[PDB]
Structure formats: structure tokens, C-alpha cells
Amino acid sequence: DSFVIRGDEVRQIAPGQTGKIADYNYKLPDDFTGCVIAWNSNNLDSKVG
Amino acid sequence: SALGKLQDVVNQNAQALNTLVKQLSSNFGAISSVLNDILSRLDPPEAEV
Amino acid sequence: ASVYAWNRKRISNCVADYSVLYNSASFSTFKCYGVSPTKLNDLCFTNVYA
Numbered sequence: 001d002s003f004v005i006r007g008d009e010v011r012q013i014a015p016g017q018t019g020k021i022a023d024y025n026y027k028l029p030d031d032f033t034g035c036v037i038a039w040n041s042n043n044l045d046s047k048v049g
Numbered sequence: 050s051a052l053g054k055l056q057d058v059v060n061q062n063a064q065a066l067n068t069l070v071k072q073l074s075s076n077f078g079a080i081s082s083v084l085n086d087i088l089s090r091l092d093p094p095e096a097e098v
Numbered sequence: 099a100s101v102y103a104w105n106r107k108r109i110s111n112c113v114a115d116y117s118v119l120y121n122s123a124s125f126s127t128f129k130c131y132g133v134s135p136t137k138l139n140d141l142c143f144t145n146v147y148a
Contacts, residue, residue, distance in 0.1 A: 008126075016093070016094035018092070018128075018135050080132060090133050091137075092134035092135075092136065092137060
């Protein structure tokens with residue numbers, strides 16, 4: 001499952017974690033098994049304006 | 050006190066049962082000893098812990 | 099006030115709507131300890147210290 005968030009929001013992507021994104025965008029199960037990968041894409045996603 | 054043996058058996062049984070009932074109201078390290086209170090105050094993860 | 103003189107306020111004898119506070123969306127952290135962030139709109143307290 002791929003998506004984009006803010007860096008400060010990477011914490012919210014975790015089982016049993018409460019937050020706006022984790023609750024209304026992408027909620028993981030409490031017994032989730034897997035692995036979360038997050039990598040910065042500022043140079044490829046940020047443009048002036 | 051002529052029936053001391055029978056009275057003692059009754060007392061032991063009653064005291065064990067009362068000790069169990071009293072032990073039903075101990076925290077054991079939880080926030081509270083009331084299961085309804087835990088359920089109404091906490092969300093699934095820490096509720097189950 | 100400053101942290102070493104943190105201001106304290108007393109809340110009682112009123113109806114607290116925590117849904118609006120939780121949905122303000124302007125709070126960086128809303129860390130609730132001992133009680134859940136949700137399910138706080140149906141609980142009753144003798145006191146609230148702010």
C-alpha cells in the first residue's frame with residue numbers, strides 16, 4: 001500500500017496509533033504483521049509555488 | 050461450642066469464599082478493578098492490556 | 099504564563115464538549131493518558147484542572 005504524507009505524520013502509520021490520518025485515511029489493524037517503509041521525496045515532490 | 054468441628058468446617062468454607070469475593074475487587078496493577086470502568090475509559094489496545 | 103509559573107484553571111459544574119476540541123485539527127499532539135482521546139465525550143468527572 002503506497003501513499004504520501006508529511007514527515008511528522010509518519011508516526012501515525014502504526015497499529016493502535018490514534019491520529020487524524022491513521023483514523024480517516026489509512027488505519028492498520030491492531031495485530032498488523034508487516035513492515036512500514038518511509039523515505040523522503042522532497043527533491044522529487046516539492047516545487048516553488 | 051459442642052459442635053466445634055462442624056462449625057470450623059463451615060467457617061473455613063465461608064472464609065475461603067469471602068476471600069475469593071474480596072479478591073474480585075483488586076487492581077493487580079491495572080488502572081482500576083472495575084472492568085466496566087476500564088472498557089468505558091480506554092480504547093481497544095490498552096483496554097486489553 | 100511561563101512554564102515555571104504554569105497557569106492553572108478550575109473547571110466544574112458545566113458541560114464539556116470535547117468533540118470540538120478533538121476535531122479542531124490545529125493541535126500538533128493530543129496525547130491522552132489513562133483515558134482514550136475518543137470515548138471522552140461520555141465520561142463524568144468531579145474536576146478538570148487546566
